[model samples]
Structures are given as structure tokens and as C-alpha cells.
Target chain A: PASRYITDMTIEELSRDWFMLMPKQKVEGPLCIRIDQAIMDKNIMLKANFSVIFDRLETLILLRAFTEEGAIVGEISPLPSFPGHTIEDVKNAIGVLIGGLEWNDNTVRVSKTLQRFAW
Target chain B: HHSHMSGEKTVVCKHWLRGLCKKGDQCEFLHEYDMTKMSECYFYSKFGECSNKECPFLHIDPE
Candidate 1:
């Protein structure tokens, strides 16, 4: 025999349950930019805006330090599932390609911005 | 007195020989093997009837 049983549910409860099932992480700079396109394409050149978050609060100082030092080279967009390619891969690939060429400081900085989202 | 009679059905056995003879001798062997055995095996049976549902191997018959 076919079984049939149903129950009503609230929208807030349903949405909260759905969010609870989703994967969450403490993503710093690159991962955050990858998830947020507005941040990634702020200057229209695809240069990443360094920012970090724990839960829902932004850690602006750490991100600023990383970005100023150029330590955070690349950022991913539309964050992918775990155990896959990451923003670091983009950074290294761009670095190697640009390393072979000679350019002025401004040109080098522009190129870095252009290469951030190439993949 | 009433007598009950029972009849036995004769099942035809299909046979075939697989592989070659290593000794190079001519031999007639009777090997009864079911062609659909693999498809009808346990693992395949778990899927139940195909129902012709999205099967890549067959085309649906138009009635």
C-alpha cells in the first residue's frame, strides 16, 4: 500500500533549515572575493579586494595588510566545493607567465589585476 | 480404485564449447551455458525491470 502523510511548515523555519544544511567556512581574502563578484570586480579590472570573515563579521585589518604586502596574489570567484582548484593556483600561474616579461611598476600592477580572474 | 498419473516434461538442454583444446586433439564437449545468465544475475536483478526508462541501449516501441 502507498503511504501518504504530510505536514505544514513555516517559511522562516524552512529557510533556516536549508541554510543549516549548507556548508560554511571561515574563508579569508581570496575565498571571500571568489564568492562575491562585486568585491572581485570592484575596479572593473578584476583585481581582488582583500577581506576575511569569520561567521558573518569582516576582518578588515588583516586583509588590508595582506593586500598591501602583495602576499595575497589571486582570488577565486563563485567559490567551488572542497577538494578542488583554488585561488592559489591562479596566483602562481599568473606569476610564472608575468615573470618572463619586463614591465614598468604600473604595468606590472595592471597586469596583476588583469590576471587575477583569468581562469 | 482410482490411479493418479504424473508426466515428466523433457527440458531441452543447449550446449556450446568455449576456448581451444591445448592438446590439439579433436574433442566434442557438452557445455550447457545460459546466454542471459549474466544479465539475469544477482547484481543485475537489483535494478528490477528496465521499464524502458531512459535506457541508452533500446528504442521505445510505438504502439
Candidate 2:
């Protein structure tokens, strides 16, 4: 059911106004652009492996705290059969589902850029 | 493995032309393999070096 909504859309369509909940990282805009280019270029045929990593300094601590307190986190699925509209959609949905918790206060940044090159 | 020929040096073939000649003197194409394999190979090799340590291959000098 979830994959039905996402399998046919382009990255631009998927990412439009998507990162409103999370603090906008400097690279998020460019990374979204790059994903658009990659999808158009057909460099990687698989949809699920495509992702943008948001590097938060407190991510590990947040995860540990959640786990230690018997809290539920989120799910990550591969493409062509994702459980939500988009990657960000799933992330936001799960984040909201957790109720009282908040993402780490540390400034989120792009740790690195990844590009898929055809061999 | 076949026995080493008498006069053959044990040096690894650095010829770089190893995969070039598929046919004899009747080779059709010229100027080495026109394929992008060499470029791809260099990209991957440089990627490995970059991951292991500081990438010396990354230069900002405009060509």
C-alpha cells in the first residue's frame, strides 16, 4: 500500500516541501538536487537504496537514550516497496509517532556527499 | 600453473598493454582501447586511496 504511492514519483516531486519538520541543513537542498539528477540519469536503477544522510552530532546519544528507556524508534525500508510515501515521509511519521521525544538539539549537518557512479 | 619458461623474468607484467590485443596484426581499432574502462578503473582506485587516507589525487588546480 505504501509503495504504491512512491514507486512512480520523481525525487523532485517527492522532496517538495518535505523537510519542514527537521532543521534545514546546508546540503539538504543540493543533495535533493543531486538525487534528482541521479534519478534522471538512471545511474542507479534501484529506488530503495537512495537516501540523504543528515548528520546530527547527538544522533547516537538519542538512539541510545531511546533504546535504554524501552522506546520504539523507526523503520527503514528498501525502494519499490517502501512503507510510506517517501524516505522523509517515513522518518517524519515515525518521529511523530514516538510522542514525547524530540530529536537531538545538536545542529544537524551533512557529514559527506555520496554519488552513485556507473561502473 | 604452467612451468616458467627459462628466459622469462619473474617481473609482473607492467606492460599495461596486456588486454589490448584480442586479434593478431589484423587489429581493427587504434589508439588503445577507446573504452571508458581505464577512466573507471582510475576513479575506483582513487576512491580506495581517499577512503584509506588523505586523498592526494584531489587537486583544485584548474586544468
Candidate 3:
């Protein structure tokens, strides 16, 4: 289970941008990110949504994308979980999960949690 | 039914592509490009025609 969820205007913006850029694709599942405290601080405004405030030891930040019908899927459960929350964590986790990226590589690879679909 | 979040999709700033957008980060549309942020094919959606032999947009018919 996700100990907490992270969201922000930037994360929402980027997510929206990615989907619209790929309009013919539809979102198929939830995207998950695991991170630590240090990575969370560099970025801005990664607000944590928790059932109880002050319970900030995050397990994973789950990004749930949905289809037109609202079905849900995807996460990095079996992988080692980390403790943290922030947009930076999301970005770094995405960078690491979608490996094989070169310094000059111009393409972003679609992954199990991060994907594309049509409306 | 489309979910509430489905409405979150945003448009890309065409002027930004032309290097003429003044709004910069304040623009309502996007300015960056990434694998997940490639603009859709205008031709594919407009006339059912994709000019590029290997067009990367999502329109999928036959090879």
C-alpha cells in the first residue's frame, strides 16, 4: 500500500502535457515512485496527501492515471520500496525506472507504470 | 465516462515551437518536448494522412 501520495501543479502539468502530446493514446494504469528525503527537497511543491497529517514516512508516491472508464493498474511493488515524497522523487524515479537513457538521448521511453493510450 | 482528471490534458503552444511565444513559463500550453510530450500528427488527425514514412504520432492503420 502507498504510505502517501505526492502531487503538485508541476507534476499535474507535466502529466497532462505528456498525454495531450500523445492524444491518440489513453492512460492505462497508475504510475508509482519511491524515493528518499534528500531527493524530495530539490524540487518545488510536492505536497503529500495522507490520511493522517504528520505521518510523513512515505512508502511510495502513487500516480494513478485512468482510462475513459476509470479502470486502474500498474506500480513497482516487488522492487525495493523507499521512504520519501516529492515531485523530485517522481522525476528521479521515472528517470531511473526508464533506464538506458543516454545524456544525449532525445526520446522518453514508455514503461509499465508510465504509458500512453487513445480516447 | 471520462474521469475528472481526464480533463487535465493540456495543449502545446505552437508559438513556442516557432520561438515566438512570449508567455514563456506562464503560457497555458506546454514548452518542453520529451518522449511523452511529442506533439500529435496534425495530418493524421486532420486528413487521415501521415506524410512522414515513419511518422511517430499515435495514428495507427496499416504499415
Candidate 4:
């Protein structure tokens, strides 16, 4: 997440922009970031969803993507690219998150949990 | 019934949160309610719309 991503045009017109949002959940903490894809033709639509959240995220960190149905797509560890974080800390966290990622059958699940995703 | 890898079909074991699954790592289902995770709802997240009357995973942003 880079502050540079917020250009004057975007921040100035953010209220007018209708964003597809995934509200914060107790289960999913700071991990939810925003991403969208749209094509006017509507013939070739590429889509996906975000699953899982990183409890501790810096201001500018790379987020892994997934399909709408739960699947592991993040193959790399994107450590912190922001201020106030140590490379050592980021590495530890990334290691946990990387190993934690699991793939489902687009439907595999926890007996007591939320839905699957494709990210 | 779907064929679980486990010879005996089973639900995600209730004992998972504390003790290891009796079936262990190789169990056909999940072990615990994994925290630090989020599941995506494509219909809602992509188009900002969902039709399921009561989709558990509803998109946010005042949808």
C-alpha cells in the first residue's frame, strides 16, 4: 500500500467513487485492501476475491491476490516497504503468512468458519 | 456423499482447537477455525452485487 497510490485526482474524488468494498471483520483484520477490475464490454471479465488477513500490516506492503473462491495464489513473501518496521520483523511475519496459506478445492472448508474464496 | 481421503467420511473434528486431530495432519478436513484469514465472495466483491438471499459472505462498503 503506497501513499503515492493516492493521487490528487483519486483522493479529491474518492467520495464520488463507488467502491466494491469488503468491510472489516473481526476475523480479518488489517489484511483487507482494495482492488477492482471492470470492462465496459462485459464479455471478458476477469474476477477474483481476497481471503485471509494479515494481523499486522505496514502502511505499504504488497498483498497477495486470490480468486473469489479460496485458493493460495501468493507464492512470494512481500515484506514491509514502509516506515517504522524492521526487515527482521517483516521477514518473520512473512514467513508465517507464507506458510499459513492453504489451498482448498474451491470449496474445502473449516467445519466452523466463513466461506471459501478465490484470491 | 463426497469421498473424503479418510477411509471414514468425517466432519471437521471438534477436537481440533486444542488437541491435534485424532486423524492428525492427514485428516481430510480442516483442523481448526483458522484465524488470520478471510474468505472472498466474488459475486459481491467483483460487481458490488450479490443475489443470495442470505449470503454469509456479503460485500461491504454499504452494499
The residue-by-residue lDDT of candidate 2 on B1-63, one tens digit each, is 877765432222212244424554334333343332222122122112112132222323323
Per-prediction DockQ? 0.01, 0.01, 0.05, 0.06
Model 4 DockQ (Cα-based)? 0.06
Candidate 3 segments whose C-alpha is farther than 4 A from its true place: A1-119, B1-9, B54-63
Q: What is the DockQ of candidate 1?
A: 0.01
Write the residue-wise lDDT of candidate 2 on A4-90 in tens digits.
121222454333332212221111211211111001111111122232233311111011111222221221222333222433443
Candidate 4 global CA lDDT score? 0.32
| After superposition, candidate 2 runs with Cα above 4 Å error | A1-4, A8-44, A48-119, B1-50, B61-63
Chain B TM-score for each model? 0.17, 0.18, 0.53, 0.35
Which pairs of residues collide in model 3? Answer: A24-A118, A25-A117, A25-A118, A26-A117, A26-A118
Best by TM-score: 3
DockQ-based CAPRI category assigned to the predicted complex of candidate 4? incorrect
TM-score of chain B of 3: 0.53
lDDT of 3 by residue, A1-119 (tens): 43433342245432332212112212212334322211111111122221212343233334332222221111222233433344334445545432312222323333222221100
DockQ-superior candidate, 2 or 4: 4
DockQ leaderboard ranking: 4, 3, 2, 1
> TM-score of candidate 2's chain B against its reference?
0.18
Model 4 TM-score on a 0 to 1 scale: 0.22
Give the top-scoring candidate (lDDT). 3
User: Which wins on lDDT, candidate 3 or candidate 4?
Assistant: 3
- Per model, state how many residue pairs clash: 3, 1, 5, 15
Q: Candidates' TM-scores?
A: 0.17, 0.16, 0.25, 0.22
